[PDB]
């Protein structure tokens, strides 16, 4: 069970911090994966975080735009977006790696999705 934040409306140039709270398992063993989907369009990979030491990999497209963090004490993942534009309006999803610290065999548990409007 993963819980994401409610809908956001932010003005161009602003910034947003969105959470994904983990529950029903031991968070301290798993990364968190994040993707992006624009209205009526496909899926794109943003990055994934190892909460333990804050290590993370970036999709080049989201290098300066995205930063990932996580609160081990409360088992929650966070993603912040900077210098928001019309292209950042989309539904964002958090998703757990199937195999502990490995990122193969697909994403087996997804969050409900959080909608962000830049306007």
């Amino acid at each position: 069970q993963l819980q994401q934040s409610g809908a956001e409306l932010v003005r161009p140039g602003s910034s947003v911090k969105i959470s994904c709270k983990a529950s029903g398992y031991a968070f301290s063993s798993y990364w968190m994966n994040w993707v992006k989907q624009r209205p009526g369009q496909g899926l794109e990979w943003i990055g994934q975080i190892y909460p333990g030491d804050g290590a993370t990999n970036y999709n080049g497209k989201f290098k300066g735009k995205a930063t990932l963090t996580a609160d081990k004490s409360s088992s929650t993942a966070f993603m912040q977006i900077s210098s928001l534009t019309s292209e950042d309006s989309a539904v964002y999803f958090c998703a757990r790696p199937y195999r502990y610290d490995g990122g193969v065999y697909a994403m087996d548990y997804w969050g409900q999705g959080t909608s962000v409007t830049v306007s």
Binding site: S28, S29, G52, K72, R99, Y100, D101, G102, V104
Partner: protein
């Protein structure tokens, strides 16, 4: 400043022989057998891999009844026993034991692989045994022996230990006790507090502490009472090279390799561990059943048994043979049935300690009394309860074993022949 005992301890010409009859120990090699509902030990754990610490009790030479007492002045001086010869007799045939674990944490064989190993599921533990590293050693002194081992150090008050975090190490000095285990090839550490797994090593050391004599510390000791003589012989080699199942506690820095793909996409456990093996055991390499002449000690205490005590620590894995004995539940059917026979394991140890003691006298002058007092106040207090009651050791009483006729004993004859006069 500390000084050799030769300074204040006078040597008489009287010599006595003393020896245990024949010590015997029988039990289970890996763990003690006890009542489940109960806690009373029915059968003890007896293994060739344990330390044997003998607490030798000597008759107080001052209370002793010598035929002649003209050799000294009971007013100005006192008497102490000095150990001059020791013979640690061993009695079973030479042989090698073997220890394992039904659920040893052993993923795959990393000594040589033809294809990338599968994938760790849940519990990939195997029933595995090994022949521990060979060790022969003998420590003698008037104080109990001291060992070292790695244990879980106390954490720094900062970053809250996340569950599963690697525990901090700390070299811990301890008193070696009779029954303690010897490093078997996995080093000297406290496996109970450093391995939650409970399956990293064989059952016999699995929830114990393997200790190693802290030779450095003991010899640095100012007075050198803990050990004034020792013999050590240890050898070991790598039999097998394995992998550890479990989850990466610390990941392999990616600057050390090129990411794989497909099968090699996921890194296999690089938490390798070897299986020890103390090679062949031999007569020519025996340390025991030979007399040790403690004439010149490297420490300042030259074999003086203050407190009429004497410690003999031993470890001999050259006679570690375990014998399996099985009894039939029924003596009928002429067809073998594994269910008809109850299989067991037992190991026996046979010792025989022998000593040659030299009577000594100490004129209790001012200086001498000041020195001895500083060194160990109890010396004087006892002269004209147990301080180590908390520890344990094979208690050996020799108060009724002293004999002036060395002639009549094997260690005795050897001594006379060796010392000529």
């Amino acid at each position: 400043a500390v000084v050799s005992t030769d300074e204040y301890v006078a040597r008489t010409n009287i010599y006595y022989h003393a020896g245990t009859s024949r010590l015997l120990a029988v039990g289970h090699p890996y763990f003690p057998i006890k009542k489940p509902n109960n806690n009373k030990i029915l059968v003890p754990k007896v293994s060739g891999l344990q330390y044997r610490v003998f607490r030798i009790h000597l008759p107080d030479p001052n209370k002793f009844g010598f035929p002649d007492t003209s050799f000294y002045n009971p007013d100005t001086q006192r008497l102490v026993w000095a150990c001059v010869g020791v013979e640690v007799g061993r009695g079973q045939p030479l042989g090698v034991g073997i220890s394992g674990h039904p659920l040893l944490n052993k993923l795959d064989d990393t000594e040589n692989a033809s294809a990338y190993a599968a994938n760790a599921g849940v519990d990939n533990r195997e029933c595995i045994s090994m022949d521990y590293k060979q060790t022969q050693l003998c420590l003698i002194g008037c104080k109990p022996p001291i060992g070292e081992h790695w244990g879980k150090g106390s954490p720094c008050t900062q970053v809250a230990v996340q569950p599963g975090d690697c525990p901090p190490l700390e070299l811990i000095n301890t008193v070696i006790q009779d029954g303690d285990m010897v490093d078997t090839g996995f080093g000297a550490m406290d496996f109970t507090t450093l391995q939650a797994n409970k399956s990293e090593v064989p059952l016999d050391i699995c929830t114990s502490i393997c200790k190693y004599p802290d030779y450095i510390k003991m010899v640095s000791e100012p007075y050198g009472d803990s050990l004034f003589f020792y013999l050590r012989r240890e050898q070991m080699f790598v039999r097998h090279l394995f992998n550890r199942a479990g989850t990466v506690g610390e990941n392999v820095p990616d600057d050390l390799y090129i990411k794989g793909s497909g099968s090699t996409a996921n890194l296999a456990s690089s938490n390798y561990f070897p299986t020890p093996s103390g090679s062949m055991v031999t007569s020519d390499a025996q340390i025991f059943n030979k007399p040790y002449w403690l004439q010149r000690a490297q420490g300042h205490n030259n074999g003086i048994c203050w407190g009429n005590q004497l410690f003999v620590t031993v470890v001999d894995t050259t006679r570690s043979t375990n014998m399996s004995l099985c009894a039939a539940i029924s003596t009928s059917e002429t067809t073998y049935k594994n269910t008809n026979f109850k299989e067991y394991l037992r190991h026996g140890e046979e010792y025989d300690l022998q000593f040659i003691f030299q009577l000594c006298k100490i004129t209790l002058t001012a200086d001498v009394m000041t020195y001895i007092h500083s060194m160990n106040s109890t010396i004087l207090e006892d002269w004209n309860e147990d301080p180590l009651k908390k520890y344990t050791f094979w208690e050996v009483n020799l108060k009724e074993k002293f004999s002036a006729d060395l002639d009549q004993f094997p260690l005795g004859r050897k001594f006379l022949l060796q010392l000529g006069l």
